[PDB]
Amino acid sequence: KKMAQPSGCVERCVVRVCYGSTVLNGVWLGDTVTCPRHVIAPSTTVLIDYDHAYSTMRLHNFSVSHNGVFLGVVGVTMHGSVLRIKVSQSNVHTPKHVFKTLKPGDSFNILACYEGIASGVFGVNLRTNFTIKGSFINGACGSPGYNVRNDGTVEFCYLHQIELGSGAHVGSDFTGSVYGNFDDQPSLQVESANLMLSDNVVAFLYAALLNGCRWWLCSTRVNVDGFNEWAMANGYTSVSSVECYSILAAKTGVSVEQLLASIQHLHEGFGGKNILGYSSLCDEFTLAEVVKQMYGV
Amino acid sequence: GLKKMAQPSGCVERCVVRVCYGSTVLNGVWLGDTVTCPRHVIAPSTTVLIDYDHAYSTMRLHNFSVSHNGVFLGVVGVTMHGSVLRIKVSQSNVHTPKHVFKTLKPGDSFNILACYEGIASGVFGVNLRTNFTIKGSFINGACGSPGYNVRNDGTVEFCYLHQIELGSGAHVGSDFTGSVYGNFDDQPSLQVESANLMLSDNVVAFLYAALLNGCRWWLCSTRVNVDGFNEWAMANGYTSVSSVECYSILAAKTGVSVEQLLASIQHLHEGFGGKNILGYSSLCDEFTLAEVVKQMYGV
Ligand SMILES: COc1cccc2[nH]c(C(=O)N[C@@H](CC(C)C)C(=O)N[C@@H](C[C@@H]3CCNC3=O)C(=O)COP(=O)(O)O)cc12
Ligand SMILES: COc1cccc2[nH]c(C(=O)N[C@@H](CC(C)C)C(=O)N[C@@H](C[C@@H]3CCNC3=O)C(=O)COP(=O)(O)O)cc12
């Protein structure tokens, strides 16, 4: 089961940012509100010149609010695709936090927001083309993505920015870099084709083994350099490392190399059969996710 | 694009507590000066059918331990109501949200806050199936994890407390009155659920989603009426369709009637024959109408 980590710590950090007639979400940490620079753009169909929109900017055009309650804007700086809006009071519900840049294969959580209010929470994976499969409509921009580490530290890593012509979603980190360097402009960009995250598929077959599902298991083995060479030719990523699968291979007796071979055979399809109710290989769950949901670690 | 989501969990996170009796531990929900929790926590360690009326009579308050975020609460009294206990504590939860208690019906969607030792670790949306079970993810210690919904007015509906995992892996809970959904027992025995029925109302919503995303290779021009479909749905593992007109918002945007979609379900019954609908290779009943219209239009 795909899960999101709980969002209360992040809910208190989501504000409403208004510039003229355009509204989106921002993230209030200390006395800074970070939001997509789309909010200062003019209503036009052309490509936006953001340097010019920044220069002709009026601080009194801003309206930043938390649950119907208005914060005073002190200043605004521009960093890549985001704005840093300094305000006259710090957020007293600021959680202990860091900023981290996601890597393809990472999982995290979206808190989907509209006019500064959370409406929904779900776990996503950052894909190898640096997009996610989320759900957003108009207004969602600035919805944050986060992870909660074991110590309680929240990692802020995503601010929603665009939905591509394909439907895949794209945002930036809090430095202002867009993931995959997509343009926060109204132009059709076509993302490159998604690879299966071989690490997640391996986690899922181990999950299959712990659930007593073994009809698919190959007796034979293929090693890492062999698998990765085959991966580059078949819409799959390289496998990370065998040692980091230790806790799942200990509990199962089945080495990673055995599942790599099983991925080559089952690549051709199942033949009407299931594997945990799925009819194709599952890209969806990482190893950490598999491990926390069967063992609580 | 349909993504199974949970409603925000923050207001529920402040009501979760650790409830301990002797050495046994589970979770509960603290509202006002009451903590509700499964009565299993006062069971004795004995592999036979628990005598809950006797274990209640031998119960001793000082054996209870109830804490929020490590901060312990004093128990003042305990009463048993079906399969849950109501524990009175000597201070009120200041973060008690406006709330009611609702019993779910088959087909209802709601949200689980998966909890262990009084700390939330995960949140997800679920649908109550026709066999009064849910497909969730829980390990030992999760008992008492709450199920909830948030109404448009901001009222949290508390509706579920996790009790048991059946041999098949499906999950059963109780509501806050103490009733177990499906009249399952909260005993370490072997009970077997009935076969699950595909939720026809959600398959209709799902097929509407597919049309609004431009996936319509499956679409039937044939119409079958509600009566005809309900009769067919019996013999093939689907529920009846409740109504038609609640989809009118979608019928208008696609030009397709509900009767075409029910003919399409009979036509799509076996499988898709290689093709897919929104990447799904068989019919999908995860999303309700309300989910589809909200995620796609914000209503
Ligand atoms: C020719 O043009 C295109 C061609 C092909 C693909 C394209 N894609 C985009 C795009 O995505 N454009 C951003 C605006 C840019 C300037 C950042 C946007 O629309 N973001 C939404 C979130 C979206 C709303 C629907 N689902 C979401 O995820 C906001 O939330 C904020 O914009 P608004 O709130 O509507 O003002 C334009 C475009
Ligand atoms: C032994 O005969 C059986 C035969 C076949 C299937 C069976 N299933 C159950 C059952 O489910 N038993 C309840 C206890 C009582 C109410 C009977 C239980 O195990 N609940 C777990 C959650 C469960 C645990 C794993 N996944 C979950 O969802 C907690 O909530 C924490 O319980 P503990 O921490 O271990 O005290 C007994 C049984």
DSSP code per residue over chain A: ---B---HHHHTTEEEEEETTEEEEEEEETTEEEEEGGGG--S-SSPP-HHHHHHT--GGGEEEEETTEEEPEEEEEEETTEEEEEESS--TTPPSEEE----TT-EEEEEEEETTEEEEEEEEE--TTS-B-----TT-TT-EEEEE-TTS-EEEEEEEEEE-TTS-EEEE-TTSPBGGG--SSSS---PPPPPB-HHHHHHHHHHHHHTT--TT--SS---HHHHHHHHTTTTBPPP--SGGGHHHHHTT---HHHHHHHHHHHTT--SS--BTTBSS---S--HHHHHHHHH--
User: Residue B25: which residues within 8 A CB-CB, separation 6 or more?
Assistant: B18, B19, B41, B117, B141
Q: Which residues contact A107 (CB under 8 A, 6 or more apart)?
A: A123, A124, A125, A126, A147, A286, A288, A289
Find, among A278, A177, A265, A279, the residue nearest to A221 by Cα: A265
Chain A: nearest CA to B77, how far in angstroms? 31
Residues of chain A positioned with their CB less than 8 A from the CB of B297: 137
Cβ contacts of B13 on chain A, cutoff 8 Å:
6, 8
Q: How far is CA A71 from CA A25, A34, A85, A95, in A?
A: 14, 14, 11, 19
SS3 state of residue B259: helix
Q: Which pairing describes strands B99-101 and B146-150: parallel, antiparallel, or unpaired?
A: unpaired
**CA separation for the pair B124, B136 (Å, rounded):** 8
Instruction: Give catalytic status of residue B143 as yes or no.
Output: yes
Cβ-in-10-Å burial (0-12, 13-18, 19+) of B165 comes to middle
Tally of CB atoms within 10 A around A102: 21
**What would the two tokens of residue B247 be?**
């989809």
Asked if B8's CB is within 8 angstroms of A7's CB, the reply is: yes
Count of positions (residues) in chain B: 299
Backbone phi and psi for residue B208, each to the nearest 5 degrees, phi listed first: -65, -45
Cα(B283)–Cα(B265) distance, integer angstroms: 8
Mark whether B81 is an active-site residue: no
Residue B24 in contact with ligand 2 by CB distance below 6 A:
yes
Chain B residues in contact with A137 by the CB 8 A cut-off are 295-298
The residue to which tokens 């093709």 are assigned:
B275
Residue among A3, A7, A279 minimizing CB distance to B137: A3
Residue A237 phi/psi, 5° resolution?
Answer: -85, 165
Residue A169 CA from chain centroid, whole number: 9
Whole-number Å distance, alpha carbon A187 to ligand 1 midpoint, is: 10
Which of A151, A9, A182, A24 has its CA nearest to residue A91?
A: A9
Q: How was this structure determined?
A: X-ray
